Design a binder for this molecule. Structure first.
Ligand SMILES: CNc1ccccc1C(=O)O[C@H]1C(=O)[C@H](n2cnc3c(=O)[nH]c(N)nc32)O[C@@H]1COP(=O)(O)OP(=O)(O)NP(=O)(O)O
Ligand SMILES: [Mg+2]
Length: 259
């Protein structure tokens, strides 16, 4: 079982990797430490091979190091994404998370640096956060060495799909683009690609070898949807992503009992 450590730079990926595998890979207090993939067997379960990757802020990234993690993800090798999330910068970290879920590779969140959040006198409702994100979440600290074995066990158990649901009208366009795509994208990641094409992402547009006919249909779908939303395609998706994350964070900061 192949488990990939994916998350923003400086979120504690390698720190967790080292704890999990017994390795002593490079860890530092600045973003951009890890620059290539490192594999290692999980000590407590030798059937699992975990992968340390350079940090990434989104799936439309701006450095060669970020490209290593993106290419790795879209190569379809991973069985599990162990998404390492900085608990003290939750909203910013969840941007990538929502794109990761869209790849259809099951996501498990290591809600890391929980000890820092503790010292800030702050709290995250782990169960609400997991419920609204539709993924398992385990609070971890690579510093205090807590939750680490638990989150790996959980990630492993996901390899044996709910996505963030946006505005109906955007969902209608994503479904239309999915139809146009057919088998021209890997089935598991289809939604990730459909959304990126809606956004007119340069990388995805160059990567996929779509026919003129597919491209014209997608163009027409985008134009129709922009007129429906009275907003440009790029903004539609970014805003939907932001609104989803905002709702999620408000749930995550809510410690009231649900009756
Ligand atoms: C006391 N440690 C720190 C507390 C706050 C900010 C930085 C540090 C620090 O001395 O450095 C690393 C570490 O110990 C610290 N750290 C990691 N996990 C925890 C954690 O769970 N709690 C605390 N307090 N600090 C943690 O964060 C820093 C980043 O860790 P990684 O290099 O593992 O991050 P990455 O995701 O692999 N970056 P990249 O390769 O994608 O560029
Ligand atoms: Mg690292």
């Amino acid at each position: 079982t192949e488990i990939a450590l994916i998350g923003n730079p400086n979120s504690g990926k390698t720190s967790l990797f080292n704890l999990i595998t017994g390795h002593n890979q490079r860890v530092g207090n600045w973003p951009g430490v890890t620059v290539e993939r490192k594999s290692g067997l999980v000590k407590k379960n030798k059937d699992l091979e975990i992968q340390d990757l350079p940090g990434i802020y989104s799936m439309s990234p701006y450095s060669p190091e970020e490209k290593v993690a993106r290419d790795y993800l879209l190569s379809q090798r991973a069985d599990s994404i162990l998404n390492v999330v900085d608990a003290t910068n939750l909203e910013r970290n969840l941007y990538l998370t929502t794109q990761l879920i869209e790849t259809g590779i099951p996501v498990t969140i290591a809600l890391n640096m929980i000890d820092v959040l503790d010292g800030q006198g702050k709290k995250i409702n782990v169960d609400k956060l997991s419920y609204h994100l539709g993924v398992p979440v385990v609070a971890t600290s690579a510093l205090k060495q807590t939750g680490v074995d638990q989150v790996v066990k959980k990630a492993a158990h996901t390899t044996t799909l709910a996505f963030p649901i946006y505005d109906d009208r955007l969902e209608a366009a994503i479904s239309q683009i999915l139809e146009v795509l057919g088998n021209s994208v890997p089935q598991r990641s289809a939604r990730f690609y459909a959304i990126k094409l809606f956004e007119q992402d340069s990388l995805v547009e160059a990567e996929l070898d779509l026919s003129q006919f597919q491209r014209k249909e997608i163009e027409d779908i985008i134009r129709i949807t922009e007129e429906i939303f009275t907003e440009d395609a790029e903004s539609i998706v970014i805003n939907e992503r932001y609104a989803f994350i905002e709702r999620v964070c408000q749930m995550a900061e809510s410690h009231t009992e649900d009756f």
